[PDB]
């Protein structure tokens, strides 16, 4: 006495199997008369139906291929595998489904971008060697901690206007060291030198190929350079996924907002990318310095970490400045750069990932229910995310499938992909709603009652006036015998 | 401050017109002008491009702006084809200060060819114009060349005029940008002027000196002000040093006689630029100058705990002992740079305390600039701004910077109130705001009979002989005001006789004449001590309202007729800010409990029904006979509320008996309830008890309901207005009066029957004898119904081995099912004194019947048809004998639809008799 396999007036194998997985059709003609051919599965196997006369199809998922999730960071045969299993097959009984688990483990090293800002004021002539050594060792160090490192650099002196500039002698515009009868490069506001690139040797050569300039006042215009390196995306070449670091080098005080009024610059800093096609800050002489608030706002907006690499005599000063720019560290710039390299090492150690699944090629005929077992074995049904993933951390997701009835196509597929990760899990989907017994169909041929029907699964689909088990009776005929 | 029609001035596009503003009040003449700086205007000087200008503007006389012929000379030549000075792109007009006839302008970006070597150096310069003489002034153009000396002094970046004709000037760039202050006597400045001399030296010059290298890049002289801070009667110098002390910022106060440091103020946040603008002014009328210091870029903890940039202003009140009392004001927007410009205004409102304007030039909507006005009070500044002016020009290619420069404390229009001028050099504009006369209005309203009595109906209602109660309302208006104001002001007064009473529910008072709860009148008032007054007589409605506890509120509001109160130029006056535009007062009315105006009730309820039992059917309406009483000081608008069961419906009060009160009542279904609401007096007389006579339908239409009413008495009293909840529960009685009766036809018979012959095997009705039919009726003639009952009926079958009444059949009406215990129609026959015969002595037949539902008054019937066995009477045993055949019927109820209710087993019985006699008796 099945709840729905007989109460629904079940009389055909196709609809008997399509109504619900719990319903199955006993096909053999040898079945003695009794309970319908679609009795409850639990008792239908014994309700006069032989074991070989009935099939109990059940949905299942098969993991054809799988791989250990690249525990260590060494090279692999083809490449590291982040998500397992790799592919699974899923034969789904109409309106049937079950659970399958997918585990993710970050193995790939993080992408990092570093932009090095070099103070080319004349006061730095003795500190130029330290700047170059630090610039080289930044790459030499980070390359040994990751592999997606991109590096670049620019420079700054001060706003090219009076009273900062050396304009007095007509021939000092090309050599502010005219007074000392030496040669120094013409002064500039801010110039972007090398874009973020993986060619470490080119960056080293360009950094070591630098020279100092000279202005008048001790405070420099480093904040303009910081703002321009922050707000200019295409020019600097910031990546949307890498961790952004902005190292800043100096050895003296810094100009702040409203310092430009002395030079006739009263327009507040716009906070927009103003580097033209010549890689120079074209609004240096008409826009004031940026306030600390704007600098912090723009740094946060673009997830740029700011590190001060300053000399001893000013460290305290900039240390205090860090308190007003949360998320920034300070390190002494000297011949021994280990102190300032520890800051970058710690910053890299602070990196964390994100995990989010995807559903790409699923049709509307199928759906998934997600249950995330995140770090610490914390189970939380109803999400597809996980935070705070280091290298080698593991999370998992148990997914319960669901299919509406019997889809219109026999074969399909869908790929589940973690966000950002190139790897994915491909799922092949098939459906077996059709009756295997119906392969022995016989329309209007022998059997039944002189034809007048279609023998499919022990019952003949008789025509009008022939309704019956084998068309031996009519729709409205009764036997008084 | 007038804000709807200020005076707007514009300069040549891109000229920064409005960078620095000031007033010009010539001593010789009477007219006043506005001075506006245009540090980028293009001048007619030979070979000079964007030299800067100072423009004098006429104000009311068509608002024309014309340049001042300060200097018509291009660069001077230190030698043939060897220029001495570089006027082009000098910011002339970047700072303008006027004192009587002395106009002082300065170019901070003026470089000169150093006399010792061909070289540019921004020593800055200034021009001082007296009545007719004009001279050039430049302390920093000295022989102290280079940045290490006064080469980059940029003198004139900030300037001020001392009270005793000493000009103070600030060079932020002197001594490697340490800064410097130069103070010189104007008389010596004009006297020592010599065009052929470029390094003029003044004997009475007060100047600061160079300090250690630790003070480099401090920018002393970024802003300057003057005020006395040592009590010597000579104004001392105040300067802001925005970059001192590791960029914390500082403010220095130097003695105004020998230039010795007096006080140092220090900031607390790095890079806040503490000292961008400073201002000395007494803000509490204590005669001691107070210091206001601006930090436009101060960052403070936000709502989320993160630092946000809002700016700040530090206000340091001076004290006699030499200490200072410091408070702080924070900006109201992010990146608005609040505190950029601080402008003393003087007594903007003549309240007796000086007021100050603080500008946030990048605040407001679209970052068009904003200015806040803070009014001074004793014990410090009113930290809450009183007015906010907003820029009205959108940025063309640069932020308008409205409010970036300000100047006040001069009464340009001569109305007794100082005016303000604000600069919008971003759009190259300057706007003059005129202060409005501040009228302080004292309005006094008083109702002499604060507590009014209806019984005081001594007032004759106009138009009819009827009487009302008249009470007085008095309203007085006195409008004082300083400065030039019209001698007469046309005030408008409006009076509402009953405030509150929301949605215009009801107003219980009306003016004696022209009855209406509102009245307005225009009353002239002259500024003075004449407390002009007026009176009105208002009367309350006896029983036109149903709320006599909430006090009647009288409300008065006055509007000054601004339209006619303006001057000849169209400047309308204003009313003081703190005076309330309305005055409201409370009247009262009392009933009973005179000494206890706060009247306190003590309610009580009781209930006892007379017919506390119901028959679950058609019956008299249920009456509760409720008792309501009170023992408190009263019970206002007393009402009885009764919640009835769904089976009960409201019925009108009982009029049969006069003891019950003649109480009107109504019904409602508020909140899905069933409420009967009646009145109990407004108010109850000394809480006297009352007797209710209300009825209810008590229509019981659900057999599953078990046996109750609830009730309470409430009042409009302000306290203890809810009586104890009192409930009653009536009971249900199953009055299912079931009766069984019957009838027989024919009632008598005569034997032998005419045309009848004896038959041994009768087959039809005629062969046997006459037909006898008995009808039995079971009726539930009661208000209560039963669902199933048992019915009985016994019949006489055979007497003396002979049949008495041969039953032919039994018919069922339908409300019951019957079964016979003995064979019916066994032979299948085609369909003197009288003695009683029946089941007692004769073989008897009984039929058992089960009866189904029988509602209130419903009935069912059972029929029996039989044949009289004639041969039984023709036998010798019964010949010439008359008999009375008897049958009996009985009933017994077993099941009632009121399953929850108790069920009683009720039974009874009756009898039906037929008579048979021998008609043909023997002859006598
Ligand atoms: C003296 C020397 C050791 C040192 C110095 O002290 N410079 C100061 C002292 C001035 C204070 N004098 C006062 N009477 N108050 C100075 O002038 N600072 C402003 C500036 O010119 N800075 C620039 C940097 C730049 O262009 O960005 C630059 O020239 N600094 C030089 C660099 C230097 C070091 C050692 C030898 C030669 C030059 C500097 O540090 N001084 C001149």
The answer to whether B746 and B805 have CB atoms below 8 angstroms apart is no
Dihedral (Cα; B588, B591, B597, B602), 10-degree rounding: -140
| CB count in 10 Å sphere of residue B138 | 24
CATH number of the domain that B796 lies in?
2.60.40.1530
Per DSSP bridges, beta strands A87-92 and A425-431 are parallel
Same-domain check for residues B660 and B760:
no
Atom 27 of ligand 1: nearest residue by CA position: A121
Same-domain check for residues B710 and B752:
no
| Six token digits for residue A173 | 């515009």
Buried b (16+ CB within 10 A) or exposed e, A304-324: bbbbbbbbeebbebbebbeeb
Same-domain check for residues B894 and B748:
yes
The length of chain B in residues reads 924
The answer to whether A401 and A98 have CB atoms below 8 angstroms apart is yes
Nearest-angstrom CA–CA distance, A402 and A365 = 9
CB contact under 8 A, A253 and B299: no
* Residue B705, domain member (yes or no): yes
Place of tokens 């399953």: B899
Q: Which residues of A touch B309 (CB under 8 A)?
A: 291-294
Angle at A168 between CA A165 and CA A173, to 5 degrees: 60
> Percentage helix, strand, coil, to 5, in chain A?
20, 25, 55
Nearest-angstrom CA–CA distance, A305 and A230 = 10
Nearest-angstrom CA–CA distance, B677 and B711 = 10
Phi first, then psi: give them for residue A319, nearest 5 degrees.
-50, -50
User: Considering only alpha carbons, which residue of chain A is nearest residue B173?
Assistant: A262
CATH number of the domain that B720 lies in?
2.60.40.1510
The answer to whether B873 and B920 have CB atoms below 8 angstroms apart is no
* Residue B567, domain member (yes or no): yes
Residue B158's Cβ-count burial label (10 Å; 0-12, 13-18, 19+) is: buried
Local structure of B244: helix, strand or coil: coil
Place of tokens 């010792």: B116
Angle between helices A128-142 and A200-208 (to 10 degrees): 170
User: Considering only alpha carbons, which residue of chain A is nearest residue B152?
Assistant: A163
Phi first, then psi: give them for residue A214, nearest 5 degrees.
-150, 135
Nearest-angstrom CA–CA distance, A132 and A119 = 11
Per DSSP bridges, beta strands B518-526 and B488-496 are antiparallel
Angle between helices A128-142 and A338-349 (to 10 degrees): 30
Q: Write the CA distances from B737 to B614, B855, B878, integer angstroms.
A: 14, 11, 42
| CB count in 10 Å sphere of residue A298 | 17
Q: Which residues of A touch B404 (CB under 8 A)?
A: 266
Nearest-angstrom CA–CA distance, B35 and A281 = 37
Same-domain check for residues B454 and B536:
yes
The answer to whether B33 and B55 have CB atoms below 8 angstroms apart is no
Nearest-angstrom CA–CA distance, A447 and A438 = 15
Omega within 30 of 0 (cis) for the link into B450: no
Omega within 30 of 0 (cis) for the link into B746: yes
* Residue B204, domain member (yes or no): no
Strands, DSSP E only, in B639-784? 639-643, 650-651, 665-668, 675-679, 690-691, 695-696, 709-714, 726-728, 731-732, 738-745, 750-751, 771-780
| Six token digits for residue B585 | 């007062």
Same-domain check for residues B545 and B610:
no
Q: What is the CA(A123)–ligand 1 centre distance, in A?
A: 7
Q: Of B732, B760, B784, which residue is a domain's last?
A: B732
Same-domain check for residues B763 and B908:
yes
Query: How crowded is the C-beta side of B799, counted as CA atoms within 13 Å?
Result: 25
Tell me which of B145, B179, B213 to substitute to probe ligand 1's pocket, judged by most ligand atoms within 8 Å of the beta carbon: B213
User: Considering only alpha carbons, which residue of chain A is nearest residue B112?
Assistant: A168
Buried b (16+ CB within 10 A) or exposed e, B724-739: eebebebebbbbbebe
Of B217, B242, B270, the CB nearest to A219: B217
Domain extent at residue B542: 438-589
Same-domain check for residues B758 and B720:
no
Nearest Cα neighbor of A270 from B362, B700, B206, B84 is B362
Q: What is the CA(B116)–ligand 1 centre distance, in A?
A: 22
Phi first, then psi: give them for residue B593, nearest 5 degrees.
40, 55
Same-domain check for residues B538 and B493:
yes
Same-domain check for residues B743 and B863:
yes
* Residue B405, domain member (yes or no): no
Atom 24 of ligand 1: nearest residue by CA position: A123
Nearest Cα neighbor of B666 from B655, B653, B681 is B653
The answer to whether A181 and A226 have CB atoms below 8 angstroms apart is no
Nearest Cα neighbor of B851 from B775, B783, B898, B785 is B785
Nearest-angstrom CA–CA distance, B854 and B778 = 9
| Six token digits for residue B813 | 């009406």
| Six token digits for residue B680 | 């109990």
Q: Write the CA distances from B670 to A16, B79, B643, B677, B770, integer angstroms.
A: 56, 105, 11, 11, 71
CB contact under 8 A, B118 and A169: yes
Same-domain check for residues B684 and B752:
no
| Six token digits for residue B768 | 């046997």
Place of tokens 């061909």: B118
Angle at B908 between CA B903 and CA B911, to 5 degrees: 160
Number of separate domains in chain B: 3
Nearest-angstrom CA–CA distance, A192 and A215 = 19
User: Considering only alpha carbons, which residue of chain A is nearest residue B157?
Assistant: A262
The answer to whether A135 and A120 have CB atoms below 8 angstroms apart is no
Q: Of B686, B716, B732, which residue is a domain's last?
A: B732
* Residue B534, domain member (yes or no): yes
Nearest-angstrom CA–CA distance, B472 and B447 = 6
| Six token digits for residue A428 | 């092949």
Q: Chain A: nearest CA to B114, how far in angstroms?
A: 10
Nearest-angstrom CA–CA distance, A478 and B919 = 66
* Residue B744, domain member (yes or no): yes
* Residue B480, domain member (yes or no): yes
Residues with CB under 6 A from ligand 1: A 121-123, 214-218, 220; B 148, 175-176, 210, 213, 216
The answer to whether B511 and B471 have CB atoms below 8 angstroms apart is no
* Residue B758, domain member (yes or no): yes
Nearest Cα neighbor of A198 from A131, A110, A139, A136 is A139
| Six token digits for residue A129 | 């060697």
Same-domain check for residues B579 and B641:
no
Query: Hey, which residues does B329 pair with through a beta bridge?
Result: B313
Angle at A12 between CA A11 and CA A16, to 5 degrees: 95
Domain-by-domain residue ranges, chain A? 56-106+356-432, 107-355
Nearest-angstrom CA–CA distance, B764 and B919 = 23
Nearest-angstrom CA–CA distance, B849 and B893 = 11
Determine the residue among B243, B249, B271 to mutate to test chain A binding: the one whose Cβ has the most chain A Cβ atoms within 10 Å: B271
| CB count in 10 Å sphere of residue B660 | 18
Per DSSP bridges, beta strands A304-310 and A243-250 are parallel
Local structure of A123: helix, strand or coil: helix
Atom 22 of ligand 1: nearest residue by CA position: A218
Same-domain check for residues B754 and B724:
no
Q: What is the CA(A87)–ligand 1 centre distance, in A?
A: 69
Strands, DSSP E only, in B347-487? 355-360, 370-377, 380-381, 387-390, 405-410, 419-424, 429-433, 438-446, 451-452, 459-460, 467-468, 470-481
CB contact under 8 A, B297 and A324: no
Q: Write the CA distances from A94 to A24, A49, A401, A414, B850, integer angstroms.
A: 12, 23, 12, 18, 58
Of A256, A268, A326, the CB nearest to B271: A256
| Six token digits for residue B647 | 């089976």
A162 close contact with B: CB closer than 8 A: yes
Q: Of B706, B732, B758, which residue is a domain's last?
A: B732
Angle between helices A222-231 and A292-301 (to 10 degrees): 30
Q: Which residues of A touch B177 (CB under 8 A)?
A: 217
CATH number of the domain that B494 lies in?
2.60.40.1460
Q: Which atom of ligand 1 is nearest to the CA of B148?
A: 14
Q: What is the CA(A218)–ligand 1 centre distance, in A?
A: 7
Of all helices (H) and strands (E), which one includes residue A366?
strand A366-373
B434 close contact with A: CB closer than 8 A: no
């Amino acid at each position: 006495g099945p709840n729905i396999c007989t109460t629904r007036g079940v009389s055909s194998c196709q609809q008997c199997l399509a109504v619900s997985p719990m319903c199955a059709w006993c096909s053999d003609e040898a079945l003695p008369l009794g309970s319908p051919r679609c009795d409850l599965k639990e008792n239908l196997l014994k309700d006069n139906c032989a074991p070989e006369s009935i099939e109990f199809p059940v949905s299942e998922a098969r993991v054809l291929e799988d791989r250990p999730l690249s525990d260590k960071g060494s090279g692999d045969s083809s490449q590291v595998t982040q998500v397992s299993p790799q592919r699974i097959a899923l034969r789904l009984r109409p309106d049937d489904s079950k659970n399958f688990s997918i585990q993710v483990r970050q193995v790939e090293d993080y992408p990092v971008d570093i932009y090095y800002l070099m103070d080319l004021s004349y006061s730095m002539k003795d500190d130029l060697w330290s700047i170059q050594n630090l610039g080289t060792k930044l790459a030499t160090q980070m390359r040994k901690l990751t592999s997606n490192l991109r590096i670049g650099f620019g420079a700054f002196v001060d706003k090219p206007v009076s009273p900062y500039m050396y304009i007095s002698p007509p021939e000092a515009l090309e050599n502010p060291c005219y007074d000392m009868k030496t040669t120094c490069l013409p002064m500039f506001g801010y110039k972007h030198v090398l874009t973020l690139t993986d060619q470490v040797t080119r960056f080293n050569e360009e950094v070591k190929k630098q020279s100092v300039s000279r202005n008048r006042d001790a405070p420099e215009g480093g904040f303009d350079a910081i703002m321009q390196a922050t707000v200019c995306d295409e020019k600097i070449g910031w990546r949307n996924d890498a961790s952004h670091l902005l190292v800043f080098t100096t050895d003296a005080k810094t100009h702040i907002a409203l310092d430009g009024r002395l030079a006739g610059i009263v327009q507040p800093n716009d906070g927009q990318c103003h580097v033209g096609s010549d890689n120079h800050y074209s609004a240096s002489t008409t826009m004031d310095y940026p306030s600390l608030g704007l600098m912090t706002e723009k740094l946060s907006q673009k997830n740029i970490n700011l590190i001060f690499a300053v000399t001893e005599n000013v460290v305290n000063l900039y240390q205090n400045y860090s308190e007003l720019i949360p998320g920034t560290t300070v390190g002494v710039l000297s011949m021994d750069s280990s102190n300032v390299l520890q800051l970058i090492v710690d910053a890299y150690g602070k990196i964390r990932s994100k995990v989010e699944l995807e559903v790409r090629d699923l049709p509307e005929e199928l759906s998934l229910s997600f249950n995330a077992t995140c770090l610490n074995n914390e189970v939380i049904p109803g999400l597809k995310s996980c935070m705070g993933l280091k290298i080698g951390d593991t999370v998992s997701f148990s997914i319960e499938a669901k299919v509406r009835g019997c889809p219109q196509e026999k074969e399909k597929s869908f790929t589940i992909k973690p966000v950002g990760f190139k790897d994915s899990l491909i799922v092949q989907v098939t459906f077996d709603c059709d009756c295997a017994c119906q392969a022995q169909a016989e329309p209007n041929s022998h059997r039944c009652n002189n034809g007048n029907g279609t023998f499919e699964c022990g019952v003949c689909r008789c025509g009008p006036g022939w309704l019956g088990s084998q068309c031996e009776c009519s729709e409205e005929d009764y036997r008084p015998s | 401050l007038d804000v709807d029609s200020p005076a707007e001035y514009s300069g040549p596009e891109g000229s920064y017109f409005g960078f620095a503003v000031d007033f010009f009040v010539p001593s010789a003449s009477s007219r006043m002008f506005l001075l506006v700086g245009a540090p980028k205007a293009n001048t007619t000087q030979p070979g000079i491009v964007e030299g800067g200008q100072v423009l004098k503007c006429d104000w009311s006389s068509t608002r024309r702006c014309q340049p001042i012929e300060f200097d018509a000379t291009g660069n001077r030549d230190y030698a043939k084809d060897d220029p001495l000075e570089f006027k082009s792109h000098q910011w002339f007009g970047a700072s303008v200060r006027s004192k009587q006839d002395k106009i002082l302008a300065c170019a901070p970006l003026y470089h000169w060819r150093t006399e010792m070597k061909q070289e540019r150096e921004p020593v800055g310069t200034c021009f001082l114009q007296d009545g007719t003489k004009t001279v050039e002034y430049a302390p920093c153009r000295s022989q102290d060349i280079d940045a290490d000396g006064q080469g980059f002094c940029q003198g004139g970046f900030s300037i001020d005029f001392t009270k005793a004709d000493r000009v103070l000037l600030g060079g932020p760039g002197s001594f490697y940008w340490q800064g410097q202050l130069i103070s010189d006597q104007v008389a010596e400045i004009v006297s020592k002027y010599d065009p052929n001399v470029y390094s003029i030296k003044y004997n009475n010059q007060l100047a600061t000196r160079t300090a250690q290298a630790i003070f480099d890049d401090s920018y002393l002289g970024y802003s300057v002000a003057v005020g006395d801070f040592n009590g010597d009667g000579i104004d001392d110098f105040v300067s802001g040093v925005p970059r001192a002390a590791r960029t914390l910022g500082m403010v220095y106060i130097y003695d105004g006689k020998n230039m010795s440091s007096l006080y140092n103020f220090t900031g607390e946040q790095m890079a806040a630029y503490f000292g961008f603008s400073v201002a000395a002014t007494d803000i509490n009328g204590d005669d001691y100058a107070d210091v206001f210091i601006g930090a436009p870029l101060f960052m403070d903890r936000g709502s989320d705990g993160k630092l946000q940039e809002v700016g700040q202003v530090s206000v340091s009140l001076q004290r006699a002992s030499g200490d200072f009392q410091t408070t702080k004001l924070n900006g109201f927007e992010v990146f608005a740079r609040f505190g950029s410009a601080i402008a003393p205004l003087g007594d903007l409102d003549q309240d007796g305390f000086n007021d100050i304007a603080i500008a946030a030039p990048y605040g407001g909507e679209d970052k068009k600039g904003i200015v806040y006005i803070f009014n001074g009070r004793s014990t410090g500044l009113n930290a809450v701004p009183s007015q906010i002016l907003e820029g009205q020009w959108a940025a063309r290619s640069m932020p308008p910077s409205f409010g970036y420069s300000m100047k006040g404390a001069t009464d340009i229009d001569k109305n007794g109130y100082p005016d303000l001028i604000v600069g919008a050099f971003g759009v190259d504009r300057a706007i003059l705001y005129r202060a409005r006369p501040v009228i302080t209005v004292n309005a006094g309203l008083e109702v002499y009979p604060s507590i009014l009595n209806q019984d005081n109906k001594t007032c004759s209602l106009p138009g009819t002989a009827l009487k009302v109660s008249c009470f007085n309302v008095r309203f007085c208006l006195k409008a004082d005001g300083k400065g030039v104001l019209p001698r007469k002001l046309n005030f408008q007064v409006e009076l509402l006789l009953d405030k509150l009473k929301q949605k215009g529910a009801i107003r219980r008072a009306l003016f004696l004449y022209s009855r209406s709860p509102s009245h307005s009148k225009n009353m002239t008032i002259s500024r003075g001590g004449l407390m002009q007054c007026e009176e009105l007589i208002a009367y309350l409605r006896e029983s036109e309202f149903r709320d006599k506890l909430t006090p009647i509120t009288i409300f008065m509001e006055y509007r000054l007729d601004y339209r006619t109160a303006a001057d000849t130029t169209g400047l309308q006056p204003i009313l003081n800010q703190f005076t309330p535009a309305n005055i409201s007062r409370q009247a009262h009315i009392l009933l009973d409990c005179g000494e206890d105006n706060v009247c306190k009730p003590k309610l009580e309820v009781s209930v006892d029904s007379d017919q506390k039992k119901i028959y679950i059917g058609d019956d008299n309406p249920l009456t509760l006979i409720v008792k309501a009483q009170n023992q408190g000081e009263g019970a206002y608008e007393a009402e009885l509320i009764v919640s009835i069961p769904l089976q009960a419906d409201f019925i009108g009060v009982v009029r049969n008996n006069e003891a019950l009160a003649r109480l009107s009542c109504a019904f409602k279904t508020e909140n899905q309830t069933r409420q009967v609401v009646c009145d109990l007096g407004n108010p109850m007389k000394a809480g006297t008890q009352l007797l209710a006579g209300l009825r209810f339908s008590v229509h019981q239409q659900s057999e599953m309901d078990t046996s109750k009413f609830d009730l309470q008495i409430q009042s409009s009293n302000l306290f203890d207005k809810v009586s104890p909840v009192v409930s009653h529960k009536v009971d249900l009685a199953v009055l299912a009066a079931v009766e069984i009766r019957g009838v027989s036809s024919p009632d008598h018979v005569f034997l032998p029957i005419p045309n009848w012959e004896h038959k041994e095997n009768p087959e039809t009705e005629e062969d046997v004898g006459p037909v006898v039919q008995h009808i039995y009726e079971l009726r539930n003639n009661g208000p209560s119904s039963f669902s199933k009952a048992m019915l009985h009926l016994q019949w006489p079958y055979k007497y003396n081995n002979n049949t008495l009444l041969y039953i032919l059949h039994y018919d069922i009406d339908g409300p019951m099912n019957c079964t016979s215990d003995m064979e019916i129609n066994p032979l299948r026959i085609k369909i003197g004194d009288i003695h009683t015969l029946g089941c007692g002595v004769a073989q008897c037949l009984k039929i058992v019947c089960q009866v189904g539902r029988l509602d209130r008054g419903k009935s069912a019937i059972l029929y029996v048809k039989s044949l009289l066995w004639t041969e039984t009477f023709m036998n010798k045993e019964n010949q010439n004998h008359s008999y009375s055949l008897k049958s009996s019927a009985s009933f017994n109820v077993i099941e009632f639809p009121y399953k929850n209710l108790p069920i009683e087993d009720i039974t009874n019985s009756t009898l039906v008799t037929t008579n048979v006699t021998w008609g043909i008796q023997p002859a006598p």
